[model samples]
Target chain A: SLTGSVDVLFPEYDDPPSEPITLLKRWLATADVARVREPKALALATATSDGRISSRVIAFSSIDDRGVIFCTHSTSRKGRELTETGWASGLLYWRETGQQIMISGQAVPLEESENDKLWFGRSVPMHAMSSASHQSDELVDREALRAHAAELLALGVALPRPPRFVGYRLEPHEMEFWAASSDRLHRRLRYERDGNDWKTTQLQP
Target chain B: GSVDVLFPEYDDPPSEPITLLKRWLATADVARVREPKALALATATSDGRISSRVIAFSSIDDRGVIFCTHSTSRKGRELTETGWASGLLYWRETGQQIMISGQAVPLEESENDKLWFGRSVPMHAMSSASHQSDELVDREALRAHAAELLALGVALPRPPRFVGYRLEPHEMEFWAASSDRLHRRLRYERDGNDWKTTQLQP
Candidate 1:
């Protein structure tokens, strides 16, 4: 187990060569090395055209200047929501560190090459579980999934990227880095994109 | 940490258990679940745009749940427009969530101020400092922030930017995710003096 309280000192924004990705990248690198689990797992939120909202946990595949990437079956609920509305947000909260990175913006579908690359890179279970997708559906049999997994494994190097699996990169309009304080006076620094540059603000905790 | 607790079927839920709601929160508190009091709030804007973000949960009792936000913030403005909001708290450690949605009425300025002042003096000052939330601002990067002020140094007066709001929940859902990928869910809705119960598919 980790010892003592966490020292979550977010760097002073004025000083850095930084933005959301840099800050998020810093935390992700730390979490991957530290005592925390599932460092890249983010709480993904989707809004329907009718103004309904829902969230689920998903793993972020990669991040860069382009945007943060996540994958799912094209027929899944999140997939439908993204294609239908084109807006989404994600949150990554590291409990042990008492820190959160909020990613919010429009969801843009990736090109087929990038999409297929992400799909083929996934593990066998991911490949099979997303076959035709039972995600967000009512409870289904577990045996079928296992059977499908076996077939995917049998294909081995012969496996091809499935068309149903997709990747989306969020074009960030706003991202915030927050850290909790025992004094109930938390820290929030929001970075809003303006063309090529970014604007930062300190929010009241 | 993943304990497979044979989750019972919630097909026929009981009427709202106020105690159960409180108990779950307390359980996470004692279990050392980090930021157990933080929740994700979702609100609908005037143009039918919905957004979700993290917020600090204040308190919960028979009265309702409480939280504070900037009146000019995206969520605050949206709440002001629709007078309703939904929020969710998911404890990854415990694999459980509490989701509540309903009408939201902004607290009186004086009342809200009372709660603001109830916090430490530094919080009070910071409350007055940030007027814009989720809006484009022409400003440079920040070198200082709220946590940085803990090393710096109170007030009796309230700030205009801060607002307190409470939810009179029309719907509440308790969800437990199972190890087998199935989720158990129970929902309760306020029906006059009684609460109506239903089960939700995951």
Candidate 2:
């Protein structure tokens, strides 16, 4: 059991490395302390043609100067949305640490080799679940899904990563780091890409 | 820790009483749950571009759920531009997830100030009022700016920039995870006066 309240010393805004990734890296190291499952897991949000946004959870594949990476079925609603709009936003919140991160930007499709590597990183059950049925499709029976996955395990066929299950990198153009206090005085530090560098600022919560 | 367990029971969609919020709140009341009232809210730009962030619910009532934000912020503008939003609330302690989507509109100025003052900590209106850009100053300067505002006797009433927006869900889906990712997904959509419910595939 974890209370949402926690007391920890966070870095001041004027400190070194005003970059959001710097904070993300620092904070991610304490996922265990936050008791957060898959601190790398984030809510992936993408929009439709008419500005309607949809979201679900995704696991982070990698992150660097380029941006963050996540794999999904290319034909899934989220994948199709990314392909059509080439944009996405992700949110990661840690309640134990009273912190959260948000980022938004263009999504660049990863190469096939890179996608394959991430695909193999998952367990058999994960793979079976992905290959069993198309996501967001109609479902008539839960037992059917369990049977299909069990069959895949029994067959023991090492199938290649589906072409549809690819990875995309969201090259973030905007990012924000937030920490809230019990007293409702939340701290917000925002960073935006300004050509070659970033412009950072703190907002009143 | 990774079982992906499911709900023991689910109500049929044909039920007369509406209890999405009640069920959602009850689920959040689980022991050790950190934030039952907060969610990852999804919003889109006019061109189908998407963004999302975690927001704490300001209030929940029979009317709907309301959250407060700076009108000039990215989400604030998106709410105005799109008038639609979808949010996800996931509670790991209970292996339950709630997804809600509906039209969003700002509260009247009269009620906006009440929500603004509801929280003990007063926000710096000067920056929040004009806070359209991502560039920002440190808390030191921001606090100083707020102090200057107080010195000018501008704290008589809450700033108009701090506003509350409400969402009346048209579509609400509840999911309980089980093993092999075979989750129990149920949907309750607004159908005129009654809510139409159905079981969805995981």
Candidate 3:
């Protein structure tokens, strides 16, 4: 028998943190404890200047002092959207924990050094695939692309980082943490960046 | 495990994206993935500030994706302001993701009421009692209100603000994960009276 109750809670709502990044870090830790698959996966949403929104699931690498970070090919559709509007929204939902975090802010590309780190950190197959295909572009042949990657891998040579591969940091201006409740009175804690500090508010489910 | 083909290869994709989309949903259902209908919905303001949240679609038919929410909620206001939105559904067990983007139009009152009544009584009480995404000073009070509505033991009337909308998609892209991290992508675009399919490089 399945119960509708949820164990998730936000005890810190009464006295919220001064900033949201640490809260995000704590939630990520809880997600890990809850054994959520791909806890760092982010449902990323980007829009053009004209307001056409596009979204996809991307991996969240880490969080720096400024904000959360991710890596992607700079010429991809998301990259182009970020370049045009400089804004994006990301959602990290963990079904096991009955929790979700939503972050929205300006997206700026990190330096090449960061990109290099991300590039070299991936597996050889990933590197080969990234090199062999242009993301989001029409594919002429699938086996041909696979063959190219296989060839690159067989060379046993160092695979240089693709120039188009870049890292992006989303500096969040608005962040919200939602926890589900059995009675349907889910808790919502929202944080808005005000200068160097954050203003917190409790919102209805 | 059922060894179902996770998705068709890039070389051989379905002509209509809707069929494939339905197939993916069916697979998720068969896999018993929790909340298979739930998806991340992204909406933007007229000025292009984007925000996303998790929502479960009530129906997925030929008209398009069907879901309901408060018209005054953040997503509702954004949907009204821009008339554009994107939806992403990722099933971890299946290692697949579906992305849909298009203009969202509000459904007729009759349709909205039908969907509204289709929900459980508890859900109706909750929707009828609380203003979504609004500031909450007292959680217990909101709960008591919903509880009171449920205690009535009758079909609660639907809130006027709670309505349904359909997203007539312009584009739908399907992504399936691979062991080598080389994912497969198939995209569909709507033409004048027909649909066009394309294979995207991972």
Candidate 4:
């Protein structure tokens, strides 16, 4: 419960987004004022059929006209939940200066070829590690993992991506960017899709 | 569609809870670690309906994973009602995550005070004035509450309702980031006093 006069004011975008990705890039660029440790870090919020909400930190790897892409194991809770319910929201909060961006929409899996390309683009360490571990499971010891990794390395095998490993693309229908100002007044701008056009509105900060 | 396993040696096998956590934290680089104590905790009713909330956490000391919040908050009521809770701690920078499920117990008054006094700042005390998750008619009303509370004094004593909570973990897991698309994840479970760890197929 935040007290103080907190104002949520939306601003006007000169060039409205033709699609969600266009607006996302603009917002990300605007958020580059300070050196953001990882501009790609986002909070992915999800819910089960019963309305229980859970949010996790995720790294945003890439974006395309189709949607915003992030990789994860299909067996993970977030991954499994996304499959069960297509709806999801990715929130990027630049707390250093109090700027926040929220994108809510549907999550769809990328094609196998798309995943393959991204898999190959990974570094050797990432490739080696990804090929070795399970997303969420009980383990007896860390040494077991080391043993598995060593064996794989000695064999010099090209680690192929596991079938459970997949990329999720989020297609946003609504985008909200917020900036906090002094005296509890905050700038908020929202872009909602209207057919092929986007509707923009500025809120009171 | 390829069935090739990548870095097989890093696969975590079952181990004791204390040992597993120590190993992960030792190797973890601090720069890449995000809020190690910010956990997304889930709670359920006796019938099994689930709800989730976020809480700032402290380290796993002798008492277990400790966190504090207003006793009147939503999470507080849920914990009081069911006593069971599940938590997920995600350190995205290091590509590491931990999940724990446990029963929560209110810390002893002295312990709670020690933790509260050590970590709390004046601003945090001011912010804690209002009952969390409770709705209000307007912004001015809420601001007034915070203003009045702050005006009292900088050394305002901890509110009676604001206390610390500690979770006695029954299950815990450590996960690492993976580049090959399949991330490394490992979990440890406790049965009574004895702890057991194992790996699940990814």
Candidate 5:
């Protein structure tokens, strides 16, 4: 565990950027510099049409002006929820940096080319395992699945992206940046999308 | 981060998941993982707008995972409106993750008072300092308010607006991360009064 300082302060309200994406990128860079592991991983939460909320940590693919991108099978629980409700929230927490970024937005499917890029970029072992295993399915025999994945790698067969295996970009409408303080007086800066601009607010923590 | 403990296969887990959860918590405590009790809590509005934030759980027992927050906060309102939530606890040191999804129930006022008083005076002062999630005029003003409360040297009453909530879990999953990314996943779902366990693909 990184026993880093928790007293790092955040930018003052008056000095915040008009938009949030740039600030998020700066913070992500800072986390990377701090040697935080899996800095791009996010605790993504998606709600079902009936208001049930579920969250799991997922590897974030990338972030740009478009939004936070991640890939998964469309038939997965989160993918189903995103397809049904079209909304999602994700939290990026870096304990070493004492910072968190909360983003809530609309979930939009990525183009097929984008999905293919993520798929073909993966290692052979990953492709084999992903192809062999049926995600979220109850296991009848764990070794059987493992053996299948190993066999695929041994055979050196081509692994193609399945039709349902895809990605989504979360186009955030609201984002909050939180910085922890040793005194428990955390700083929070919230940005709400306003047309092409953003409206900022300071929230009590 | 010890490889010896990675994915320790267990042929027979405890009959109840709470026992397994306690064991994991104990392991985390012994490892001195930072903020072992902290959870990424996910809550949603009645209309299905989802949100997630980190909150430290105060305790976990038969009643369920317990935590406190302001009653009028966005999470609190959403929990009340939807009566459902999901919590994820990840310990980077051990590469272990626990995810719980359940119905959220607000604790009684007395239970809330117990939690409020269990915290330190400075914490109480901070809790009383500002309306949570409300727009802050400025940081200095908020600090000044809490400082003044601390200067009083009086017992701070439990804020009526603050309350405690318990997430009664219906499903819980334990995941052990692997180097190859084929993580070990074990899920427990409430089966009547007991739990039914299953292994899931990574």
Candidate 6:
């Protein structure tokens, strides 16, 4: 049963297109069939210089022809790392059906106007709450924050997107999709970018 | 970009454990909620070595955090050996998270019998049919175990090794989601029978 003959769903790419963003959008649309329950949610993993690892799930909001777009605070640990190293990986799991997708590459921030457009369309309550949130701050009393939100909402002030609040786009250099089968044997396919071309290859799983 | 700090506030006074748990569960029911009650249970060996494993969990009565597994499983054996476990419940959708660390004691045999009898669906029992974390020759063996269990009479007795373990928390924390790159973190530490709350660096 462990015969390494599992069918590869996606192949690895050696010489992928110079613009990996295009490939990511195409794959997301195609491979997302089995994805349910927060199909847009992705597990973002980052490693510190000391080998400390942290991962959190974030929503994938939109994708451009150039990269996969999401939003976050520029001051976040993940945000800081992406800004400094310009690299990150997003893990997507359709665990109900045993399928996984991983994307790794560079992350770039979107412009303020783009962030504004996204923020404006959100629910007013969300805007009010976000306006009062200091993101990651310590508080002795949480009711004070709620009071602040209420005050801001009562003022009818159009909450502006915080300076740190912005969009991020991941330009993937490598993307892999996995489908697990019985007996612990699974199917894996990878797509990679090389210069101006796109390539694909099957992997042992 | 520079690091920013976003602190979470505990506006509401500390309520009894039951009230706090009920409020958390209520908030979890909101739309667009991510996986709730999915946690990483961390435990240490009798010699003080730490290990962590993720589990799908449900809370029962205010005193117990419940998770089910094959009693003879690896983690199960560890729990039996150490009698301690810590749980971290992460709700990514709302950015609210809970962490509970405590001693774990196995549910009594009578309780196990009650739980087994109450399971109306086979899928819930399917996971308990075989020892967890054990390698199998094939998937068919797992199916066979399920089939065997299903064939039992309606008054099926709980497997001797099939039991529930509850973690009675000594310490717990609740964290809110941060919008700015800063992640909000807050913790309530208990000393003896008294509790003290504090903020943690992200």
| Full candidate order by TM-score, most accurate first | 3, 5, 2, 1, 4, 6
The CAPRI classification for model 3 reads as: high
lDDT values, one for every candidate? 0.67, 0.72, 0.86, 0.62, 0.84, 0.59
Candidate 5 residue lDDT tens string, B62-124? 858999999888898888888999999888788888888899899998999999989998998
User: 5 or 6, which is superior by TM-score?
Assistant: 5
iRMS, all models: 4.6, 3.0, 1.0, 6.8, 1.3, 9.2
Fnat per candidate = 0.11, 0.53, 0.85, 0.15, 0.75, 0.03
lDDT of 1 by residue, B3-22 (tens): 34333435544445555578
Model number 1 iRMSD: 4.6
Compose the digit string of candidate 3's lDDT tens values, residues B62-91: 869999999989998998888999999988
Q: Which ten residues in a row have the lowest lDDT in candidate 3 chain B?
A: B1-10
Query: Which whole-number lDDT from 0 to 100 does residue A115 have in model 5?
Result: 91
Top lDDT prediction, candidate number: 3
Total clashing pairs for each candidate? 0, 4, 0, 27, 0, 26
TM-score-superior candidate, 1 or 2: 2
Worst 10 residues of 3 chain A by lDDT: A1-10
Give iRMSD, candidate 6.
Answer: 9.2
lDDT tens string, model 5, A8-52? 645544589867888888888878777887788788888777777
Model 4 chain A: lowest-lDDT 10 consecutive positions: A1-10
lDDT of 2 at A136: 62
Scored by DockQ, the top model is 3
Candidate 5: deviation at residue A15, Å?
Answer: 2.2
Q: What is the C-alpha lDDT profile of model 6 across B5-24, one tens digit per residue?
A: 12224434354444565577
Higher-scoring candidate on lDDT, 2 or 6: 2
Candidate number with the higher DockQ (1 or 6): 1
Interface DockQ of each model: 0.21, 0.46, 0.81, 0.13, 0.75, 0.06
